Design a protein around this nucleic acid. Structure first.
Ligand code: MG
Ligand code: MG
Ligand code: MG
Ligand code: MG
Ligand code: MG
Ligand code: MG
Ligand code: MG
Ligand code: MG
Ligand code: MG
Ligand code: MG
Ligand code: MG
Ligand code: MG
Ligand code: MG
Ligand code: MG
Ligand code: MG
Ligand code: MG
Ligand code: MG
Ligand code: MG
Ligand code: MG
Ligand code: MG
Ligand code: MG
Ligand code: MG
Ligand code: MG
Ligand code: MG
Ligand code: MG
Ligand code: MG
Ligand code: MG
Ligand code: MG
Ligand code: MG
Lengths: 88, 55, 271, 117, 103, 54
RNA sequence: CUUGAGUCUCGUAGAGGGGGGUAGAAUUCCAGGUGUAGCGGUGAAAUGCGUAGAGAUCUGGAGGAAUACCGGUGGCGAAGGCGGCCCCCUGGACGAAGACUGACGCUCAGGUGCGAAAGCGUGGGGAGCAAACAGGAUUAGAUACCCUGGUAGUCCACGCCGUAAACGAUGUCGACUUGGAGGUUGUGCCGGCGUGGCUUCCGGAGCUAACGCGUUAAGUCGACCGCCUGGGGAGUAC
RNA sequence: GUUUAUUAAAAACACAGCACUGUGCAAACACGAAAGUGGACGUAUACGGUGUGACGCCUGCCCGGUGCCGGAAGGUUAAUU
């Protein structure tokens, strides 16, 4: 999956601690990076149905986490989505 | 199932050794297993039936 | 790329057309064209010999190399072009010394490949070799019947032959009709299959789309008079006769081959 | 005609018939005889006694070659596997090897459907 | 940047021109920032069963740590080089620097 | 287990060339699978005979 | 706030999914070499094949389909299902010590997606097997069971179909409730002592009309959903 | 779309589509006492003959007769001697 270097970079640059690996923003960043990466894999592999399920699970989990962040704090929510370049 | 014949080894001993080799390798049984076709459902059914009879 | 046209007109309702988006779009190479005039199915006496021929679009002849005689000089394919004189496409090549020629396009050949002819040529599509250096069992096209003459077998679009044996000084081929023939082992052949396999997936669609090819209408035998065809005549729709060609020869079932000087090379009939 | 002194006996015994041939080391055949090619026709055509008779007559048919050594190759699950070997040995011959070459697919091809009897 | 076992057997009659070329392979590896961990020449051996009417073959084993694309190009070279009759590239989990059972 | 230890792999092959069951030799479950993989790797690599007929 | 839920570090086994390449055995066909009168098939027979040289045997070539042994009341998968070997891409599960977010959770009508075999459309492919079909037998008859041949189909790429005794005839999530005999996969201490996950058989209280289930419940409970209301007519008609 | 110029323009001819069949190239076939020529400067996804007539569902039973293809155990049978 995601390389150790990429995850280390995103958590050491994007979270509010040296070892912050559990915040909502960090999770959303990891899921969006993995989704963007797997888009390329699924471009050439239409008939891969047993990984489409994992991709759908990641999408749903990202949606629920963003729902929670919107419900709790809206300002940092908008900050996160503008950093990540998303719509909702 | 190759069986040779040596000096001071009579006919019947070599014949019995060849028969034992054939029995061990199960050549005739394996041939008679591929006589016809078997539905995979029947394969799994007979396998489980034998396994539950053994228990 | 077989595409079906939308039925905006009665003549376009049934049309299916094969478009290749790789053919050269401009004009052909100038020093390799000639002139031909349509005959209409008429010989030097002016009489009609073959019926249902006449008219059509004008064409020019392209000098295609069927010998590949020059050897030891690699060549690079320049581009693929459309030839109206046949059913396959032709690919212009540029030899290392500066000479250009037309060859038949094998299957899978594109611009930027390399070809080669001779006795040391590599075994890959596009090359041509005598059938004694070619591995038995392979598939070839543009075969010769006589050593030195030129490519004369399996030359249409999509066709090919297969070498099945080598009985000393000869080879045995399985032709597209199923007939097995013996040819000299010194005849050359070209590796691969001739391209444009989508030729028979084309529907002409209308009556006038066959007159662009120069094909005049066919009149049925029973629709004639007793003085014109053996089948002609009747009050209504009457046949009562064994089917025959317009000249009396039986047309449905009868064999017509008669050639005793080449029957020695026919291993078996197509049947 | 020719002298070899060591051939190879090929036995092909199936559920209905047994065919016995003798060849050279290079594969070239010399003579043959079958259980059904000996008058045993129908149900008796497969019984091992027919195999023994076929082996004996086939051995007698190769009296002009003068062979003293043999190998045997056994094929098929037919009943003619032991009787043929004994007949070959007891025909005045001498076998120095025994080998089974029955073909066995390693999967291959779908067999005919089961006989509903 | 992964470890690999590379085994190949080559025609015995070409044995006299095997050594130098494997160096080139090593060179290629060392040209692509790859690491050689072990290289043993098993030599001429009798095959367990005849391969295309041959009986002997020259077996050579190489131990590499290299990126995947270099292994891909090496595999293509092995495919086209008619001298070698067979080859096999196995991806391992760690370095296997030791004495092989052959020697 | 590796395919390069042919001497030990000899002990787990029948006379014909097959693979002995686990219950006959009493070995474990995982080692049987790894052994079978090694045997197949060696059989492809022309180190072991596929069959016995010749 | 951290006990529910999830992220990070390490490692573990696996027919989990997709793409490409490749090794052996075997049936069929084709071309050569020896050899001559049978081969094949049934309970018994013949249609069928063979003197233009079959069948048997040896060397070689082509093509297609499936991977002997290992092999397991084994393993993976949400379900249908998944098996020779190697590389590339990729999903899930699990285990020891710890760090992190702090209820972010469960179920689900509409909706979206996957979905054995057969069947359809377009284009390739065709070794074996084999609906329809042809002939030989059996029989009072035999549109079959038996025998010899054989076209769709079975194979691949794409797009449809959306059905099965699609079954554990048992909806998903969580909590509590005597035991025994095993299989498989991780970890700690000195063959033993603990500890988790998945699974097979027997059986106690309890439950059921009974058969039986029984810590993987059909036992004691909470949440949400789906479905049932006599048999034909009928899963039919509009 | 074509047709009986000058009493018949139609349901008649043609047609895209389907099938049977012949043809291995000095191709089958046609015009020629012959040489030659068309087919074709094309090579079985090509050419000739025959019937039916877009598209949809489909196309059953009969090989005695008359044709065509294949077989040769027997009978009769020309020129020749
Ligand atoms: Mg015509
Ligand atoms: Mg026509
Ligand atoms: Mg017409
Ligand atoms: Mg008229
Ligand atoms: Mg006239
Ligand atoms: Mg007339
Ligand atoms: Mg009329
Ligand atoms: Mg009438
Ligand atoms: Mg009439
Ligand atoms: Mg032969
Ligand atoms: Mg806190
Ligand atoms: Mg749900
Ligand atoms: Mg619903
Ligand atoms: Mg289809
Ligand atoms: Mg089709
Ligand atoms: Mg149900
Ligand atoms: Mg019910
Ligand atoms: Mg499970
Ligand atoms: Mg109940
Ligand atoms: Mg119980
Ligand atoms: Mg309905
Ligand atoms: Mg009009
Ligand atoms: Mg007019
Ligand atoms: Mg008029
Ligand atoms: Mg008028
Ligand atoms: Mg008509
Ligand atoms: Mg009809
Ligand atoms: Mg008739
Ligand atoms: Mg008749």
């Amino acid at each position: 999956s995601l390389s150790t270097e990429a995850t280390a970079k995103i958590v050491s640059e994007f979270g509010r601690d040296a070892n912050d690996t559990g915040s909502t923003e960090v999770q959303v960043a990891l899921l969006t990076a993995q989704i963007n990466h797997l888009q390329g894999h699924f471009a050439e592999h239409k008939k891969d149905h047993h990984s489409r399920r994992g991709l759908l699970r990641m999408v749903s989990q990202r949606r629920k986490l963003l729902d929670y962040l919107k419900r709790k704090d809206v300002a940092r929510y908008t900050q996160l989505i503008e950093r990540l370049g998303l719509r909702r | 199932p190759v069986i040779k014949v040596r000096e001071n080894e009579p006919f019947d001993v070599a014949l019995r050794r060849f028969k034992r080799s054939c029995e061990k390798a199960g050549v005739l049984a394996e041939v008679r297993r591929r006589e016809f076709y078997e539905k995979p459902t029947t394969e799994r059914k007979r396998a489980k039936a034998s396994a539950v009879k053994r228990h | 790329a077989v595409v079906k046209c939308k039925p905006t007109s009665p003549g376009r309702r049934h049309v299916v057309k094969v478009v290749n988006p790789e053919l050269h779009k401009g004009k052909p190479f100038a020093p390799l064209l000639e002139k031909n005039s349509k005959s209409g199915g008429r010989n030097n006496n002016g009489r009609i010999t073959t019926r249902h021929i006449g008219g059509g679009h004008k064409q020019a002849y392209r000098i295609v190399d069927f010998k590949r005689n020059k050897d030891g000089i690699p060549a690079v394919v320049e581009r693929l072009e459309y030839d109206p004189n046949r059913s396959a496409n032709i690919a212009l090549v540029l030899y290392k010394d500066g000479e250009r020629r037309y060859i038949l396009a094998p299957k899978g050949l594109k611009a930027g490949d390399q070809i080669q002819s001779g006795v040391d040529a590599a075994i890959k599509p596009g090359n041509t070799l005598p059938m004694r250096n070619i591995p038995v069992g392979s598939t070839v096209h543009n075969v010769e019947m006589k050593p030195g003459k030129g490519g004369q077998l399996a030359r249409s679009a999509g066709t090919y032959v297969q070498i099945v044996a080598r009985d000393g000084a000869y080879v045995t081929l399985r032709l597209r009709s199923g007939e097995m023939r013996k040819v000299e082992a010194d005849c050359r052949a070209t590796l691969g299959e001739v391209g444009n396999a989508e030729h028979m997936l084309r529907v002409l669609g209308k009556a006038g789309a066959a007159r662009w090819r120069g094909v005049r209408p066919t009149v049925r035998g029973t629709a004639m008079n007793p003085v014109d065809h053996p089948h002609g005549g009747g009050e209504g729709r009457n046949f009562g006769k064994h089917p025959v060609t317009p000249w009396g020869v039986q047309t449905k079932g009868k064999k017509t081959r008669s050639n005793k000087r080449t029957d020695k090379f026919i291993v078996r009939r197509r049947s | 005609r020719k002298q070899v002194s060591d051939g190879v006996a090929h036995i092909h015994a199936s559920f209905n018939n047994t065919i016995v041939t003798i060849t050279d080391r290079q594969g070239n055949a010399l003579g043959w005889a079958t259980a059904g090619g000996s008058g045993f026709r129908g149900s008796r055509k497969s019984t091992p006694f027919a195999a023994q008779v076929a082996a004996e007559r086939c051995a007698d048919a190769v009296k002009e070659y003068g062979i003293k050594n043999l190998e045997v190759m056994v094929k098929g699950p037919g009943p003619g596997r032991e009787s043929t070997i004994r007949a070959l040995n007891a025909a005045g011959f001498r076998i120095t090897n025994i080998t089974d070459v029955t073909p066995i697919p390693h999967x291959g091809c779908r067999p005919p459907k089961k006989r509903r009897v | 940047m992964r470890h690999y076992e590379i085994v190949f057997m080559v025609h015995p009659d070409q044995s006299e021109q095997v050594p130098g070329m494997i160096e080139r392979y090593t060179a290629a590896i060392t040209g692509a920032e790859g690491k050689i961990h072990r290289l043993e020449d098993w030599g001429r051996r009798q095959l367990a069963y005849p391969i295309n009417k041959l009986h002997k073959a020259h077996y050579v084993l190489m131990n590499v740590e290299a990126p995947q694309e270099v292994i891909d190009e090496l595999e293509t070279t092995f495919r086209f080089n008619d001298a070698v009759i067979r080859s096999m590239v196995m991806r391992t989990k760690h370095a296997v620097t030791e004495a092989s059972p052959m020697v | 287990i590796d395919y390069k230890d042919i001497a030990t792999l000899k002990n787990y092959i029948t006379e014909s060339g097959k693979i002995v069951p686990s219950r006959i030799t009493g070995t474990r479950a995982k080692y049987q699978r790894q052994l079978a993989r090694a045997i197949k790797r060696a059989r492809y690599l022309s180190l072991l005979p596929y069959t016995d007929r010749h």
